[PDB]
Design a protein around this ligand. Structure first.
Ligand SMILES: [Cl-]
Ligand SMILES: [Cl-]
Length: 129
């Protein structure tokens, strides 16, 4: 599923992400835009052989099992394929574990490089939430 901007903001707001660990909703929408272009089916292979999955590009070397990332951890206890659902619940629940692990949203390279320190509230402006 390719989300609309406001559609995803509402969905994320309705999975508890607004101000989760202090990150306002716009941060999450911004990260999703640049990680996956709002596409729940996005996958990208990393040089170390891991793969990033889903609208927040959650990485198989730590967070999900895809059966092909040797010696990886599955800190979220999900198959990575669960992260490609049109239902973002699994991605959101796993993202909450990631953002809580000490490095905040800096775990998302696109967030640090394209969202951090920008006017992220612009990503939810015009949405009725
Ligand atoms: Cl915001
Ligand atoms: Cl933080």
């Amino acid at each position: 599923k390719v989300f609309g901007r406001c559609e995803l903001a509402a969905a994320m707001k309705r999975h508890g992400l607004d101000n989760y660990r202090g990150y306002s909703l716009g941060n999450w929408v911004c990260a999703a835009k640049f990680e996956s272009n709002f596409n729940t089916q996005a996958t990208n292979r990393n040089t170390d052989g891991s793969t990033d999955y889903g609208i927040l590009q959650i990485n198989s070397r730590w967070w999900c099992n895809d059966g092909r990332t040797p010696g990886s951890r599955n800190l979220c206890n999900i198959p990575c394929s669960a992260l490609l659902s049109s239902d973002i619940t699994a991605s959101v629940n796993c993202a909450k574990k990631i953002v809580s692990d000490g490095n905040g949203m800096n775990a998302w390279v696109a967030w640090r490089n394209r969202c951090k320190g920008t006017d992220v509230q612009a990503w939810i402006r015009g949405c009725r939430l």
